[PDB]
Structures are given as C-alpha cells and as structure tokens.
UniProtKB/Swiss-Prot annotation:
The lineage of its organism: Eukaryota, Metazoa, Spiralia, Lophotrochozoa, Mollusca. This is Chi-conotoxin CMrVIA. It is found in: Secreted. It comes from Conus marmoreus. Expressed by the venom duct. The modification 4-hydroxyproline is found at P10.
Length: 11
C-alpha cells in the first residue's frame, strides 16, 4: 500500500 513515490497516496 504505502510505498513513498506518489503513485502511493492513501497510507
């Protein structure tokens, strides 16, 4: 889910 680069937004 919560990777770092902003393909991943809702953590």
């Amino acid at each position: 889910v919560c990777c770092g680069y902003k393909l991943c937004h809702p953590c």
